[PDB]
Amino acid sequence: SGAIYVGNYRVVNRHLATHNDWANLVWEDSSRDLLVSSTTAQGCDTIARCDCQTGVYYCSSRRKHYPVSFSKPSLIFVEASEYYPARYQSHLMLAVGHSEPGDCGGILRCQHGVVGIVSTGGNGLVGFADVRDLLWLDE
Ligand SMILES: CSc1cn(C)nc1NC(=O)N1CCC[C@H](C(N)=O)C1
Numbered sequence: 001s002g003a004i005y006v007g008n009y010r011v012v013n014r015h016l017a018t019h020n021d022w023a024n025l026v027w028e029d030s031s032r033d034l035l036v037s038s039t040t041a042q043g044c045d046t047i048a049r050c051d052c053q054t055g056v057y058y059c060s061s062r063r064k065h066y067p068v069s070f071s072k073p074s075l076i077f078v079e080a081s082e083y084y085p086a087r088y089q090s091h092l093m094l095a096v097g098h099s100e101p102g103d104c105g106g107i108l109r110c111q112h113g114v115v116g117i118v119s120t121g122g123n124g125l126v127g128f129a130d131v132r133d134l135l136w137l138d139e
């Protein structure tokens with residue numbers, strides 16, 4: 001679990017969104033596993049606006065942060081699960097790192113701010129749903 005709080009927005013993995021998230025929906029994209037909902041309070045997370053390929057992510061299954069090199073956002077095939085059939089997930093970045101399903105939501109950050117959230121894994125790899133292209137999170 002985990003979310004990004006910036007302005008009047010909350011960003012979560014779409015597969016982990018709540019009834020409140022869906023009843024306060026701004027935008028959602030199943031192909032990216034993202035869902036953004038509105039909030040009453042003001043969030044102060046800075047979103048990175050960069051092309052960084054290095055950063056640090058929070059791994060809840062180890063109660064530890066890990067430094068990673070990660071790939072450019074792209075269309076990567078993702079196995080079927082209880083939330084989605086087998087499909088290509090877009091805007092996904094992979095890195096060599098430990099992850100388990102409950103890790104989804106963990107933030108990935110570089111020196112410029114929040115890069116994205118843990119969204120996929122398996123086989124000694126971890127995938128992050130990129131949010132840097134969502135410029136409207138600031139306006
Ligand atoms: C949840 S990350 C993970 C780590 N391991 C070992 N296995 C993992 N499971 C996954 O990759 N997914 C299950 C939850 C939804 C994900 C998606 N975005 O389609 C796919």
Ligand SMILES: [Zn+2]
Pocket residue numbers: 048049050051052110111112113
């Ligand atoms: Zn950066």
